[PDB]
Amino acid sequence: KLPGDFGPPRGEPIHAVLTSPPLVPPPVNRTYPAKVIVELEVVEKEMQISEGVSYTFWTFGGTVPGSFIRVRQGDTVEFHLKNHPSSKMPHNIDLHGVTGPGGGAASSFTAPGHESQFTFKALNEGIYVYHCATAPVGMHIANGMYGLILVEPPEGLPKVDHEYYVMQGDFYTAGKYREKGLQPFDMEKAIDERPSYVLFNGAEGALTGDKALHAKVGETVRIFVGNGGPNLVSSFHVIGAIFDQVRYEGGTNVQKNVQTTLIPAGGAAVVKFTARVPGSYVLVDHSIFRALNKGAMAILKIDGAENKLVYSGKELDSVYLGDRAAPNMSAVTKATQASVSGTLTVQDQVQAGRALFAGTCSVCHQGNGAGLPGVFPPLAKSDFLAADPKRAMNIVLHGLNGKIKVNGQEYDSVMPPMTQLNDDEVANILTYVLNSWDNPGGRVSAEDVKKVRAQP
Amino acid sequence: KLPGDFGPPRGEPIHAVLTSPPLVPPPVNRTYPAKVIVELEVVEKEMQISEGVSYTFWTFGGTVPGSFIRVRQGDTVEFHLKNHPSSKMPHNIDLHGVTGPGGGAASSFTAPGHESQFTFKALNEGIYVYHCATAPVGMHIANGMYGLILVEPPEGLPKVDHEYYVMQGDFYTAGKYREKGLQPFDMEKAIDERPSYVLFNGAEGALTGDKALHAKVGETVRIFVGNGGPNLVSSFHVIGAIFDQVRYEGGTNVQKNVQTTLIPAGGAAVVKFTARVPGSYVLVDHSIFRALNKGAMAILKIDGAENKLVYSGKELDSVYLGDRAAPNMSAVTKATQASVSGTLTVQDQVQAGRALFAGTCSVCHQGNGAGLPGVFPPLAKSDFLAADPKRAMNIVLHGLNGKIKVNGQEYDSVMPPMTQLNDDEVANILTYVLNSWDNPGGRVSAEDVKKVRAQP
Amino acid sequence: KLPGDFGPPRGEPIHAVLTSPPLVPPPVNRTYPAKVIVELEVVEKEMQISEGVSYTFWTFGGTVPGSFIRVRQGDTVEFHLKNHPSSKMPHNIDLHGVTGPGGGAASSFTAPGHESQFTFKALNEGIYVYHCATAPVGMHIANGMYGLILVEPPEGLPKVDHEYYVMQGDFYTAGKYREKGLQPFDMEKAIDERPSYVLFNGAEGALTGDKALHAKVGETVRIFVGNGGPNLVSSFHVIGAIFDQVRYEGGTNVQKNVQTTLIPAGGAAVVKFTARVPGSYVLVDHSIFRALNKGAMAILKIDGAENKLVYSGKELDSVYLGDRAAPNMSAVTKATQASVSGTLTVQDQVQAGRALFAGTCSVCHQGNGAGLPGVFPPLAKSDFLAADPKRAMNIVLHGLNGKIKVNGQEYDSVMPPMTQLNDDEVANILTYVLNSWDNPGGRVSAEDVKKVRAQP
Numbered sequence A, B, C: 001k002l003p004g005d006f007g008p009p010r011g012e013p014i015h016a017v018l019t020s021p022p023l024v025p026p027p028v029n030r031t032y033p034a035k036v037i038v039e040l041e042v043v044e045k046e047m048q049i050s051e052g053v054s055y056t057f058w059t060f061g062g063t064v065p066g067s068f069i070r071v072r073q074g075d076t077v078e079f080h081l082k083n084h085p086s087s088k089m090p091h092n093i094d095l096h097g098v099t100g101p102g103g104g105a106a107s108s109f110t111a112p113g114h115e116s117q118f119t120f121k122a123l124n125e126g127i128y129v130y131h132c133a134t135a136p137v138g139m140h141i142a143n144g145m146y147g148l149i150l151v152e153p154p155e156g157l158p159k160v161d162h163e164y165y166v167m168q169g170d171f172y173t174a175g176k177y178r179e180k181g182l183q184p185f186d187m188e189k190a191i192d193e194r195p196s197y198v199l200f201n202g203a204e205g206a207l208t209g210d211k212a213l214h215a216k217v218g219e220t221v222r223i224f225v226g227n228g229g230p231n232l233v234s235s236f237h238v239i240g241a242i243f244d245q246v247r248y249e250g251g252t253n254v255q256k257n258v259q260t261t262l263i264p265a266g267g268a269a270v271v272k273f274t275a276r277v278p279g280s281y282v283l284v285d286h287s288i289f290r291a292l293n294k295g296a297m298a299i300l301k302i303d304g305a306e307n308k309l310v311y312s313g314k315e316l317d318s319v320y321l322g323d324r325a326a327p328n329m330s331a332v333t334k335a336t337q338a339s340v341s342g343t344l345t346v347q348d349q350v351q352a353g354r355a356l357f358a359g360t361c362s363v364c365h366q367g368n369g370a371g372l373p374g375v376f377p378p379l380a381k382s383d384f385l386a387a388d389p390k391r392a393m394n395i396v397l398h399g400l401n402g403k404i405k406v407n408g409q410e411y412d413s414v415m416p417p418m419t420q421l422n423d424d425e426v427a428n429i430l431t432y433v434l435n436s437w438d439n440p441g442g443r444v445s446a447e448d449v450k451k452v453r454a455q456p
């Protein structure tokens, strides 16, 4: 007998309602197998991969990851793929969980402006990645062509308070991390498995700040977690919490009470979380430079009463979360646009710099620039800053050590170089500082920084 | 008590019959512990790692992976390692599953032209990697010195219709992927874990096309899957199917009903597959640039009747499998040899280009060069191609965008650069196209392409 | 109900006794929940990451990994973090296993010369990584800021004969592997996940030779194994043995009878080993260039009677373990210091070269330099060596092939290049050889090698 042998489809054909991340369709809530009609459209479009950084994404349903599909084991799925006429590339689909060559790939080949269809029976319960399977496949996947399909067990999953959809991917831009402008795909970095960004849900900050996932103390949360790759394996982890359950694909095995779990490239898992105490819980790839240097962080924010018997401490802040502690970094987007338009004002720079100062600089110099006397020198009303703005550019790029005097006090410490900051970021940060805390005002330009970077 | 305590060896000494990949020795089919004599010979030799690409492999038994060894838990194994007189390096062996320092390494050190032996009891059931353990060990492993030993449980494994032997490895050549000639090992790429090839069974195409694994609808297939490394961890996956069972080494844990599973460097697993519907099922490392850009694909081809209730779609083709959809790429080998000999003909180039055109170019331009009017321009009887062959070289290497006119119709799309193609590959592809579909004939040489690559 | 609901703390407050690697605190041996006071101090200090190679480590408790903390599920932990006044950076802590945002991070922020405290209930049994969580977090982790906390189940873990503490990390120096001197952290290699060293317990040789872990035949050994990362996933493996049990974090799953197991970045596991036969058992990351080219090897040395029925072979030697077979490589440290001081003698070089010759050269040329007539030429009383010392430098760096005559016998083989050896290493090795085995004496300097490396 084949698995999923629940007989022919019955009832009426069901048009599947698909959802955009990070939301999930409702439970199927059905006791009979059905014919389920799935309609998905490929759209190629520019979107912001980071503030001020555009990328040409290739998408299933207009999002990265693509629309979530939810069916029942034993269903007959009539899958329709449409390729929007604006597309330049052909596309197709391989759904993990399909029983048949290519997971649908040969029969779903769809040129721009065309449609295709194929039918499969969902024999296999589980959570599964789907992705494009069009040569060059790695390029298509790298450009965002992946999503999740859930094939429910016949009785449904246990009830929870919230269900969310989170998918990791690695991305390959010609430019470096946070370098502004429309960034091409970089095939050489992709072949070498050297991503410039590693993201949840297609963008930096997609699930942080005002875009966080939400729940309340006492509630249960199920997260459908994909790893589209193309190349990286996620050391997937929740900061400050534990997973009650982790189940990979449709596996019989269920691990319970783990905090860190390896998700293969192309893999998927269902995790369950129970909210205990309020605050922000961070989903990360614990290959930690991905999480804290390339974008791979997402937030589940829990509302409710503190329990000092369980945890006496404070909510997360910019020391750990960096510049993603805040609701958003919209000022960076605005300043980048203003630079393109040739209308960049001092205030545009100040507000972008404010956003970027958090964590990056405030960890040592404090959010108010006061530092810590004799330990971390002040940026507030700083004589040393005022005396030489070009020196300040060199300090950000190249670091500073040795004995200095600031506001009448000696320091003898080490500020590491921060050369990974882009010219606009340094410029904006320093313009923020110059226009705060009784400093002398004025501005630093990206071009000013470019010149210092070329001659330390 | 130690595990495997089934008493002293009984019966007669058994000379083990070892098999070359992808075949496996028969089940031991024995109820008593034996003394098993294993004889393995190291041979260093050039073989083709890809068509026209030679490599000096170091082998156990003349193959990569090395010969498969099959014994029973509780057996006493008298292991004999011989190092062929033609060898330049000394060699030895570490068998995972051996209880004792180095897994045999110190007592198996064997200079060229020598032999060694040691004896161990197989206490531990499971599937296990063996490999060379001679300084510099990573070099020996990278050169192909790894294989599998199966230690059966006393009652044997459950009966299946087919057993196969598949082992992943990462390889490090001085040249780039598909660059022709005898390629040295590259220690710098090896230390950086930046392989040029990632392969099953020692070569591109080792298990594709006419070298695929076979079974029929309804049959069960057990695959002994190794990962020799040296360095990579496989996101091991079957496209279009599921694994009934995955069991690592001799672990008590068995995962069931998973499609994607992580195999450590040095690790091994036993997977089971049940054939449901006909077609080609692809074993891959789903760190997908390895599978589709570096060689890490293998095929299990299933014969039998379609079942439209389960899968309505078609067999895999070159859109997904690329140039490995075909039975073989022997024409590439032949053309590379003819170049070396100084006898390369137009037809030699045409037949190599034909092989290389599949997927790489046909995904957009079609197998007949017709394209799709207004979407993908024709290569068949193409005025634009004929008008400027050097332009065509530049388009392959460097891409093309913007409005063009071909055969009286405007196109306004994007052909990505294909700079990873080697000079001979571009030359051969374009010579194929020029000599097909009423195009004007002639040829493009590797030297012609080299010149365009040096000045875009 | 929350997990760990064993009621309020009772008895007296307990001041936790923390241990330095590779030792573990005693079992808590307690049937009631307690208030446990933990005091940990951050110290930034230079230590030797390899012989003659200094690094500025940032530590919890003065060691890498940091001090081991051992508590009972259901305990209330009052955690005190102090930052030594000599520190330049602020620090904090995220303990995996803590229920609360950041795992303690916001409330543990501690500037140099300050202290902080927070309280948490240990709801979650398991073995857990702790680490610094101060921007830039990856830098702090890379500099050594990680350790383990064990939260025992209420009944305690089963009794074993020995408990040890082993933690992997990846490290990023500006210089190459084994390049001498004080090495800065390299942010570019860290972001690219390209470590120069991969170590157990903070240094090359930390757990080899005279620093090996010990047990006797018949004894059980539990190892608490961490992977601090920041970035790598360990293919964690024991050479020549098997793990009776592997349990990750506080997971319900326990794998039994495996040799190779994947430990995520940030992950931890408890493994159990039973000693069967004497000799050295190697813990490695089986992404094997890490183990054999970057430092990722540790030894469990078992004392007792051989059992020829189980294993007939010899103890590990330098063929497999390389230059870590010996008790230590102190002579390298001494020679590097003498170079810095300008007092380097011939004998200083000879003794450093002796240490470095093992495995690296002896695998082929033998420990006595005799080679194997006609196969591996002698370095003992070698006419060919004596005839041209600069040629010998070129051979080490750049290899040698083709027909040569040494001591009246022809060789026609291949010595691979060894360009990864640093100038001082080549110099010292060759000075050792020149001053051994009736060779002519004299010396080779690092500067001599530098010149040959610049012009092959």
Ligand code: HEC
Binding pocket: A360, A361, A362, A363, A364, A365, A375, A376, A377, A378, A379, A382, A384, A385, A392, A395, A396, A400, A401, A402, A403, A404, A406, A411, A412, A413, A414, A415, A416, A418, A429, A430, A433, C089
């Ligand atoms: C802690 C790790 C720091 C971070 C992050 C940043 N800075 Fe810093 N800064 C730090 C120290 C210890 C010092 C003094 C070094 C010494 O030689 O003793 C400094 C110094 C500066 C200065 C100059 C002095 C002053 O005006 O107070 C400037 C202008 C400065 N730092 C700016 C700055 C900015 C803009 C940062 C974010 C990009 C930043 N610093 C981070 C320590 C640390």
Ligand code: HEC
Binding pocket: A089, B360, B361, B362, B363, B364, B365, B375, B376, B377, B378, B379, B382, B384, B385, B392, B395, B396, B400, B401, B402, B403, B404, B406, B411, B412, B413, B414, B415, B416, B418, B429, B430, B433
């Ligand atoms: C789809 C992703 C493509 C692949 C793969 C290949 N080509 Fe292509 N090609 C494509 C487009 C959309 C265009 C037109 C670009 C525009 O500006 O609108 C082209 C064009 C060419 C041409 C020139 C026009 C013609 O003669 O039809 C040539 C000679 C050409 N392409 C060759 C070619 C070859 C040999 C390829 C495999 C190496 C190949 N193309 C791949 C789209 C795509």
Ligand code: HEC
Binding pocket: B089, C360, C361, C362, C363, C364, C365, C375, C376, C377, C378, C379, C382, C384, C385, C392, C395, C396, C400, C401, C402, C403, C404, C406, C411, C412, C413, C414, C415, C416, C418, C429, C430, C433
């Ligand atoms: C086996 C893989 C080797 C290792 C490791 C090392 N050497 Fe070697 N060496 C080897 C061979 C096969 C040869 C001869 C090459 C040929 O063309 O046939 C050599 C040669 C030398 C020589 C010159 C000849 C001599 O004096 O015997 C020297 C000086 C030499 N080798 C030194 C040397 C040192 C110092 C090494 C460790 C750094 C070393 N070799 C490693 C094979 C192998």
Ligand SMILES: [Cu+2]
Binding pocket: A058, A089, A090, A091, A092, A132, A133, A134, A140, A145
């Ligand atoms: Cu696509």
Ligand SMILES: [Cu+2]
Binding pocket: A094, A096, A131, A266, B286
């Ligand atoms: Cu896939």
Ligand SMILES: [Cu+2]
Binding pocket: B058, B089, B090, B091, B092, B132, B133, B134, B140, B145
């Ligand atoms: Cu070998």
Ligand SMILES: [Cu+2]
Binding pocket: B094, B096, B131, B266, C286
């Ligand atoms: Cu091994």
Ligand SMILES: [Cu+2]
Binding pocket: C058, C089, C090, C091, C092, C132, C133, C134, C140, C145
């Ligand atoms: Cu720190």
Ligand SMILES: [Cu+2]
Binding pocket: A286, C094, C096, C131, C266
């Ligand atoms: Cu962590």
